[PDB]
Amino acid sequence: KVQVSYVIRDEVEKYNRNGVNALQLDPALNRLFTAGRDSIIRIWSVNQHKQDPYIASMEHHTDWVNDIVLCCNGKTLISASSDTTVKVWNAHKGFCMSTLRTHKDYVKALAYAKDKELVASAGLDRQIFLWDVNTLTALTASNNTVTTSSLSGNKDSIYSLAMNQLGTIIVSGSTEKVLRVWDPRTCAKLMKLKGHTDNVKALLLNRDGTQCLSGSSDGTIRLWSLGQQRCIATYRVHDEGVWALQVNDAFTHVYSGGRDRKIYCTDLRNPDIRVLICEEKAPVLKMELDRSADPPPAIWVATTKSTVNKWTLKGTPLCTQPDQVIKGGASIIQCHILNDKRHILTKDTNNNVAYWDVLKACKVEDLGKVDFEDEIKKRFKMVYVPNWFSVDLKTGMLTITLDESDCFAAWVSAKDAGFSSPPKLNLGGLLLQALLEYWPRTHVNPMVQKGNGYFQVPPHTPVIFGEAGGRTLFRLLCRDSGGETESMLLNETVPQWVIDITVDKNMPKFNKIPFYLQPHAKKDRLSASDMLQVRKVMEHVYEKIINLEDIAVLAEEKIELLCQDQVLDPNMDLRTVKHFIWKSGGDLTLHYRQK
Amino acid sequence: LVNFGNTCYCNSVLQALYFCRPFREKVLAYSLLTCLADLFHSIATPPKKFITRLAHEFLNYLLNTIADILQEERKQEPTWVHEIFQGTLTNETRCLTCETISSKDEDFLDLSVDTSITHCLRGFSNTETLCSEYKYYCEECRSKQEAHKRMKVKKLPMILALHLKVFPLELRLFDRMYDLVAVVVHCGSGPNRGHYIAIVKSHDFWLLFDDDIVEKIDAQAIEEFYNSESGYILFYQSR
Ligand SMILES: [Zn+2]
DSSP: OEEEEEEEOOSOOOSOSSOEEEEEEETTTTEEEEEETTSOEEEEEOOSSOSOOEEEEEOOOSSOEEEEEEETTTTEEEEEETTSOEEEEETTTTEEEEEEOOOSSOEEEEEEEGGGTEEEEEETTSOEEEEEHHHHHTOOSSSOOOOOOEEOOOOSOEEEEEEOTTSSOEEEEETTOSEEEEETTTTEEEEEEOOOSSOEEEEEEOTTSSEEEEEETTSOEEEEETTTTEEEEEEOOOSSOEEEEEEOTTSOEEEEEETTOEEEEEESSOTTOEEEEEEOSSOEEEEEEEOSSSSOSEEEEEESSSOEEEEEOOOOOSOSSOSEEEOOOOOEEEEEEOTTSSEEEEEETTOOEEEEETTTTEEEEEEESOOHHHHHHHTOOOOOOOOOOEEEOTTSSEEEEEOTTTTTOOEEETTTTTSOOOOEEEHHHHHHHHHTTTOGGGOOOOOOOOSOSSOOOOTTOEEEEEESSSOEEEEEEGGGGGSHHHHHHHHHHSOHHHHHHHTSOOOOOOOEEEEEEEEOOOOEEEEEETTOBHHHHHHHHHHHTSOOOOHHHHHHHHEEEEETTEEOOTTOBHHHHHHHTOOSSSSEEEEEEEO | OOOOOOHHHHHHHHHHHHTSHHHHHHHHTOOOHHHHHHHHHHHHOOGGGTGGGOOOOHHHHHHHHHHHHHHHHHHHOOOHHHHHHOEEEEEEEEETTTOOEEEEEEEESSEEEOOOHHHHHHSOEEEEEEOGGGOEEETTTTEEEOEEEEEEEEEOOSEEEEEEOOOOSEEEOOOOEEEEEEEEEEOSSGGGTTSEEEEEEETTEEEEEETTEEEEEOTTTHHHHOOOSSOEEEEEEEO
């Protein structure tokens, strides 16, 4: 079942708008890749030279980017996302080449065997796929054939995954707590390493796949001998879960980080000698060693914050301030939909408050650090408009989702919607038309209209067609629909319930409210538009019941309307009356009175 | 036309409840409640016809209806149903992404669990993984994530009405000892197989209600001879 969504944002989001899940460092180009919870992958220059380390954004994913792996000497990036896909990128030019769709839930982890250019992917669906990288990059629009290889045995959701450099061993970590080991060449099961009492989010193998390091939410790091199939050491240097591991080339020192924010370098042969490298400002999600020199000179660190810190390594914390800092942006952490179902108030991590227009897909004004709830109450308007969208803050930006069940639920008058009133508009229907305004197939004359005639969304707006619960089907920017590739993919992906409105120019159904009308202090059965104003009922009564210049005026002068014993405002619509005043059950009941 | 459920089940619940002395005393000293009152008066002044004097699971329906009755005629004027049966449980939910634990307390008149009875109630129970199409919305992650849900009892009731959907005569919750006083069970075999039965504590021996006949049975004929529609019910009174 297909939903339409779109993201309200600027054309360029230079900075991460949420935390960072994974990191990759290209030593030949001095480039750092960050995989964002904001769904964007970004390339940075790590020269302490440049004042602006930003290089490019890599934009295709629909949800958290959980993992990335640089392959083929920095030529190729492979990404894993909560949108259930694995994507193949040209890492030099920064564009998406292929999308693998074999996963059925969040893809959580990637693994890489450099000597075979072999990668593997794993996620919450308990599947592990193995991919030859040169086979994936060779994919074209004609050579469209792909074949798979997978591992079985995982009884639970996979959170981590590692291969050795030789591609002879692969291990997964999961909420099953057990580590599962296979031969990636044959997919044969090798062993089960038992010992952890919680999830395992961090795994490393030495180069010839004879030892393994696991970091676990039980707070321990464990060293494993694969020849003995057992744990040969347990290190307890953290207070909470270990989420991230790095190791030196000699597989003799382990760098660890996790929820307690502390980062340690521990000697594996002699645990008691360990060094507190730093305490980060937020739980550590991933770390990437600078490997310019043996004793690595620095470590890059990803946290739940949008900023990314490089910490220097020259040996009570070793470091107190990061050595380099890649700046991040604010996340939208709180959201309020106003009663007009048209505007939104936000608060972000900097405690800045903004006011937005969902319909025009844009910001209206920045309000700075005013009180958020006092600001809500200040903009309160007594009006009811049926719910017609949903908002989510998972990327740290505003993402709006439309569903067939209620997308067309909200008819409002053009005047109350703030448009020229020289006339009833359906909000969801106007938006769909703005989102698909550049799609030529929508350029239709109902006996030529392009767009909806009241507003546009910004041309750079991402428009997403996905399945409820997970799978993105197709994503483009609003302005790109006229493309030949885009029009083809739209025809294949746009559900008939959107076509109905955007192509056929068909009106959605109206909504009516049944109500009773009876004297205050003879019960009639009526029905009217949910947007009908109280005045019209007053006129009704004046004309056809208590009926002993303008009629609206005389009606207003003679007839008083009540609901739940409150005198009603002639400008209020039935919808609003029922929502704010009708406090009873069964049909709305209005009482009429001679003034 | 409304269905209260299986006849024998409902009768067995009613019988078990009569041998919850504090519930018995307070109804005797007292709708659905007035009928329950008259029925218990009769018994104190035929078992198969108990429910007739009066399908959602009957016990929970019954206690809550009395709770609502007593809460309402309290409003016009700690209802006694609450002081006898009300306990408090806590539902822990742990996001597996941020590993933050959030807690929510809930009142209960009866308690369902899906290890041992003693190990359950003393530790955690009803462990459940939220995943796939039913992930947890985490307020820390602001998105759907996998979660581990589990239940711990916060406040033990005077009488613990336990739904199991191997039972000990005494329960040690150390700080509180509980004695088994009633059982509602659907026997697989034994001379009472076929339908729901009530087994109750009376003074210092055990009675068994089967259809219309009350019969004494020896202690530990109980766990020597006792597959179900609504599981089985254990009533524990604290000492
Ligand atoms: Zn969370």
